[PDB]
């Protein structure tokens, strides 16, 4: 409704990079969890970019 796609896109990109940098700082058990969450955050960002 607002058409503020770029603001939310940058916000979600920051979220993505945060998850990526936290991926290497985490244990394997929760590493799997971070990777599984990345698979969906990237879908979010790709949809918003489209």
């Amino acid at each position: 409704q607002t058409n503020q796609f770029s603001k939310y896109w940058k916000e979600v990109d920051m979220k993505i990079k945060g998850l990526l940098d936290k991926l290497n700082k985490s244990s394997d058990n929760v590493k799997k969890k971070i990777e599984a969450l990345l698979v969906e955050y990237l879908h979010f960002n790709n949809v918003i970019g489209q």
Side-chain angles (χ1 to χ4, degrees):
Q1 305 167 330
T2 62
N3 292 93
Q4 300 185 31
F5 291 109
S6 198
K7 150 273 203 289
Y8 194 25
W9 194 95
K10 295 182 183 179
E11 184 173 336
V12 175
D13 174 68
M14 289 299 301
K15 285 274 195 56
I16 290 165
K17 294 186 178 182
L19 278 167
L20 281 171
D21 65 51
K22 192 192 174 186
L23 179 60
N24 290 320
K25 187 70 176 184
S26 294
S27 59
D28 300 324
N29 292 18
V30 71
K31 174 181 70 64
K32 292 183 181 181
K33 181 152 39 189
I34 295 182
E35 294 186 11
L37 292 166
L38 288 172
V39 179
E40 290 277 348
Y41 267 85
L42 293 173
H43 168 61
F44 293 164
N45 195 33
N46 196 254
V47 169
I48 299 171
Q50 293 184 42

